[PDB]
UniProtKB/Swiss-Prot annotation, chain A:
Span covered, complete protein: 150 to 198 of 247
Top-level lineage group: Eukaryota
Gene name of the record: CENPH
Protein name per the record: Centromere protein H
Localization annotation: Nucleus; Chromosome, Centromere, Kinetochore
UniProt record similarity statement: Belongs to the CENP-H/MCM16 family.
Subunit and partners: Self-associates. Component of the CENPA-NAC complex, at least composed of CENPA, CENPC, CENPH, CENPM, CENPN, CENPT and CENPU. The CENPA-NAC complex interacts with the CENPA-CAD complex, composed of CENPI, CENPK, CENPL, CENPO, CENPP, CENPQ, CENPR and CENPS. Interacts directly with CENPK. Interacts with KIF2C and NDC80. Interacts with TRIM36.
From Swiss-Prot, chain B:
Induction of its expression: By follicle-stimulating hormone (FSH).
Subunit and interaction comment: Component of the CENPA-CAD complex, composed of CENPI, CENPK, CENPL, CENPO, CENPP, CENPQ, CENPR and CENPS. The CENPA-CAD complex interacts with the CENPA-NAC complex, at least composed of CENPA, CENPC, CENPH, CENPM, CENPN, CENPT and CENPU. Interacts with SENP6.
Section covered of the full-length record: 190 to 567 of 756
Post-translational changes noted in the entry: Sumoylated. Sumoylated form can be polyubiquitinated by RNF4, leading to its degradation. Desumoylation by SENP6 prevents its degradation.
Organism: Homo sapiens (Human)
Superkingdom in the source lineage: Eukaryota
Keyword Nucleus: yes
Record protein name field: Centromere protein I
GO annotations of cellular component type: cytosol; inner kinetochore; kinetochore; nuclear body; nucleoplasm; nucleus
Protein family membership: Belongs to the CENP-I/CTF3 family.
Chief location bin: nucleus
Keyword check for rRNA processing: no
Record GO biological process: CENP-A containing chromatin assembly; chromosome segregation; mitotic sister chromatid segregation; sex differentiation
Underlying gene: CENPI
From Swiss-Prot, chain C:
Organism: Homo sapiens
Compartment(s) of residence: Nucleus; Chromosome, Centromere; Chromosome, Centromere, Kinetochore
Subunit structure, interactors included: Component of the CENPA-CAD complex, composed of CENPI, CENPK, CENPL, CENPO, CENPP, CENPQ, CENPR and CENPS. The CENPA-CAD complex interacts with the CENPA-NAC complex, at least composed of CENPA, CENPC, CENPH, CENPM, CENPN, CENPT and CENPU. Interacts directly with CENPH.
Homology family: Belongs to the CENP-K/MCM22 family.
Tissue-specificity statement: Detected in several fetal organs with highest levels in fetal liver. In adults, it is weakly expressed in lung and placenta.
Disease linked to the protein: Chromosomal aberrations involving CENPK are a cause of acute leukemias. Translocation t(5;11)(q12;q23) with KMT2A/MLL1.
Residues of the full protein shown: 109 to 162 of 269
Designated name of the protein: Centromere protein K
Residue spans crossing the bilayer: none
Main function: Component of the CENPA-CAD (nucleosome distal) complex, a complex recruited to centromeres which is involved in assembly of kinetochore proteins, mitotic progression and chromosome segregation. May be involved in incorporation of newly synthesized CENPA into centromeres via its interaction with the CENPA-NAC complex. Acts in coordination with KNL1 to recruit the NDC80 complex to the outer kinetochore.
Domain of life from the UniProt record: Eukaryota
Coiled coil stretches, renumbered: 1-43
UniProtKB/Swiss-Prot annotation, chain D:
Self-association state and partner proteins as the record states: Component of the CENPA-CAD complex, composed of CENPI, CENPK, CENPL, CENPO, CENPP, CENPQ, CENPR and CENPS. The CENPA-CAD complex interacts with the CENPA-NAC complex, at least composed of CENPA, CENPC, CENPH, CENPM, CENPN, CENPT and CENPU.
Compartment annotation: Nucleus; Chromosome, Centromere
Keywords: Centromere, Chromosome, Nucleus, Phosphoprotein
GO biological process, one term: chromosome segregation
Entry protein name: Centromere protein L
Modification sites for Phosphothreonine: 17
Domain of life (superkingdom): Eukaryota
Length: 49, 327, 54, 306
């Protein structure tokens, strides 16, 4: 049961490191979509409306 | 608009409580009920209606309210008492913003919204919620870890054991606070930077008793460092208590060091895998990690063959020496 | 008495890290479907759409 | 983060105080330093606290923070009319190191129902606190030392607000009885040509069921002629200069009363410069040597955090 628990602990470390790198890629994609949302909101004649 | 009649005023505001949405909270309806608070004073049907308005839209009201324990209305299941008083009684006169932390009730509410999660008003509520412990596992931001260092180092320093007037009730709450730490270090699989900084200042000041089992599990989940930094701060002050205390302490050191040999070798087994960044070969870094752990086992192996001479061949220590070499 | 209590601790530890592996896989299956919806929604609404809708 | 690691190992080792210290210089008041503000800071009773460095602190968001503090401390008195209003006043020119952040003042001034009476005074500062500046980021604002004037119930209801906004925590400050002897030797190392008070010491006997206090007064012209016979290396105050100065004061007490006061505990040092107490009570009575004492209080305030 100790080698089963240590195999569960190694799989928990691998899924935790994969979720950490995936949330790092998602937050860099979120900053990329923030730069694209700031870039796609340029207008001059909209302020009177 | 039925609030102009004063005799119907608790009867209107209970119907206003059950029919309020987010779009129904309007700033002129803030303005009239603050004028009714100034004219006819504090009434419990008007304070409970503004308590729901602070529960729905706090930004529209500039007047803060108390948060005291009141029943606010008819409640607590009194439907037979309502029917007895119904005969003749009281009938004559894409979003880049943030998500609030208090709306997380269960597990799938955080699974739908993890990319927008705000920061709380204190760092003591991170240990209270297990849903906030999932946020620490995947975020490697710098000021969210330094503010957690600035809180819990002040928690272990002021509310410790020997800084008090020897209260057994506050030591039970300090034992219950250390049970939160040893489940948080195992769920994270790295020790906190507050917790190894407290053991730098407490191992000269510790004698060997007074919640020994919560202190020897606090040394069990310390992360990996160099061998020359640990030995003046830990291994000198451990060996002053190891050869001199009882044999139940001598078995509990080697149960703590076999869990220290678990979590140090678990980090070094996958540090090779997650680093493709350095173009230099890692045989100097693994060779610098080779003599850090081979002098670890030969120090505890020097602790094992010297303490055998102290007790003169007892088998009860000899079961837990060979459990350390199982690792 | 100290190894059977180590067995009774580890059967309690057999429940908790299996629950912690079940939570971390539930993080892993939910971060996969939020990565797929973010990759499919890289392109936002158009610049000419905002002028004609408003 | 790597300079945060190197500041732990000086605290984890036993050495934290240098044995040879510098005599503090004559801090002249500049033209940028307000003369009418520093007279209000003198002759006041203060309670010291140490604080972790703040988060998202800006110098232009003080108008919003003045309205949130005035809406909360009235509400904490209602949970348990008030014509009170807080003033966030900023002071200039107190710093000697250019990398220190700007200190400021927090008052509670009552309104005119007929200048109002000041009920509470808070003061955040960082004087020569350069060792904690490279251990924090540039987003953090490092003001470790805090001084309070007023009731402790008004301190806790405003200290609740810094816990729930700036992510910090107040801790009580305490000065050891070993460290009262160094600041008494620094106050006898001063230069004076004016009106002076009396050097007052007070010891407490720990080996009693009751309290036992001894008031002890030294004339400062007699203290200056006692100092320079001990002080033989100019420019530095050494380890052996202070411990022989305390031994000849104990041997002066020993030939009269035969009571060893070296087993006792020094708790109050009051000289011509300032008065001190071990639980954080201070009374600064001088303006020429103002920042020399306050840099020594930030020398202790970083040590209780780290």
């Amino acid at each position: 049961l100790e080698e089963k628990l240590l195999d569960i602990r190694k799989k928990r470390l691998q899924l935790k490191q994969a979720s950490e790198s995936k949330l790092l890629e998602i937050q860099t994609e979120k900053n990329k979509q923030k730069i694209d949302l700031d870039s796609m909101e340029n207008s001059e004649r909209i302020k009177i409306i | 608009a039925s609030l102009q009649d004063d005799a119907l005023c608790p009867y209107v505001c209970h119907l206003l409580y059950l029919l309020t949405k987010k779009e129904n909270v309007k700033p002129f309806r803030v303005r009239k009920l603050l004028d009714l608070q100034a004219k006819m004073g504090m009434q419990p049907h008007l304070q409970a209606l503004l308590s729901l308005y602070k529960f729905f839209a706090p930004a529209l009201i500039s007047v803060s309210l108390p948060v005291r324990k009141k029943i606010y209305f008819k409640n607590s299941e009194n439907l037979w008492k309502t029917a007895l008083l119904a005969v003749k009684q009281r009938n004559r006169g894409n979003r880049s913003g943030s998500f609030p932390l208090e709306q997380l009730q269960s597990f799938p509410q955080l699974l739908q919204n993890i990319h927008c999660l705000e920061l709380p008003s204190q760092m003591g509520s991170v240990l209270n919620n297990s849903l906030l412990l999932h946020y620490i596992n995947c975020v490697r931001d710098e000021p969210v870890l330094l503010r957690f260092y600035y809180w819990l180092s002040q928690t272990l320093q002021e509310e410790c054991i020997w800084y008090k007037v020897n209260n057994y009730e506050h030591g039970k709450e300090f034992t219950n606070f250390l049970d939160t730490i040893i489940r948080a270090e195992c769920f994270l699989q790295e020790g906190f930077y507050s917790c190894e900084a407290f053991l730098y200042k407490s191992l000269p000041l510790w004698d060997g008793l007074c919640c020994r089992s919560q202190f020897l599990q606090l040394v069990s989940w310390i992360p990996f460092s160099s061998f020359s930094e640990v030995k003046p701060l830990l291994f000198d002050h451990l060996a002053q208590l190891f050869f001199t205390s009882t044999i139940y302490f001598k078995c509990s050191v080697l149960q703590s060091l076999k869990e220290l040999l678990q979590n140090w070798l678990l980090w070094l087994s996958m540090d090779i895998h997650m680093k493709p960044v350095t173009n230099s070969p890692l045989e100097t870094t693994l060779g610098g990690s080779m003599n850090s752990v081979s002098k670890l086992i030969h120090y505890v192996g020097w602790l094992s063959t010297t303490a055998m001479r102290l007790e003169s061949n007892n088998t009860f220590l000899l079961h837990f020496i060979l459990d350390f070499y199982e690792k | 008495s100290t190894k059977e209590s180590k067995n009774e601790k580890l059967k309690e530890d057999l429940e908790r890290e299996q629950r912690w592996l079940d939570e971390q896989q539930q993080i892993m299956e939910s971060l996969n479907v939020l990565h797929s919806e973010l990759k499919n929604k890289v392109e936002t609404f158009s610049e000419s759409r905002i002028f004609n809708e408003l | 983060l790597q300079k945060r690691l190197e500041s732990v190992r000086k605290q984890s080792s036993f050495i934290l105080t240098p044995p040879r210290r510098k005599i503090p210089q004559c801090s002249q008041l500049q033209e940028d330093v307000d003369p009418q503000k520093v007279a209000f800071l003198l002759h006041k009773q203060w309670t010291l606290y140490s604080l972790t460095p703040l988060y998202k602190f800006s110098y232009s968001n003080l108008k919003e923070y003045s309205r949130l503090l005035n809406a909360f401390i009235v509400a904490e008195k209602q949970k348990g009319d008030f014509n009170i209003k807080v003033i966030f006043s900023t002071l200039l020119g107190m710093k000697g190191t250019q990398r220190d952040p700007e200190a400021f003042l927090v008052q509670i001034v009552s309104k005119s129902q007929l200048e109002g009476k000041v009920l509470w005074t808070g003061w955040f500062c960082c004087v020569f606190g350069d060792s904690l500046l490279e251990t924090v980021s540039e987003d953090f604002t490092c003001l470790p030392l805090f001084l309070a004037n007023g009731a402790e119930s008004n301190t806790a209801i405003i200290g609740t607000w810094f816990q729930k906004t700036f992510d910090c925590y107040f801790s009580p400050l305490a000065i050891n009885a070993f460290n009262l002897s160094w600041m008494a030797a620094m106050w006898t190392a001063c230069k004076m040509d004016h009106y002076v008070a009396t050097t007052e010491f007070l010891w407490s006997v720990p080996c009693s069921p009751q309290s036992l206090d001894i008031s002890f007064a030294i004339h400062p012209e007699d203290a200056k002629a006692l100092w320079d016979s001990v002080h033989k290396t100019p420019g530095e105050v050494t380890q052996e200069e202070v411990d022989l100065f305390m031994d000849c004061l104990y041997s002066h007490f020993h030939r009269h009363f035969k009571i060893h006061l070296s087993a006792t505990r020094l708790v109050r040092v009051s000289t011509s410069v300032a008065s001190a107490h071990t639980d954080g009570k201070i009374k600064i009575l001088c303006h020429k040597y103002l920042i020399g004492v306050l840099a020594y209080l930030t020398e202790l305030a970083i040590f209780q955090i780290e």
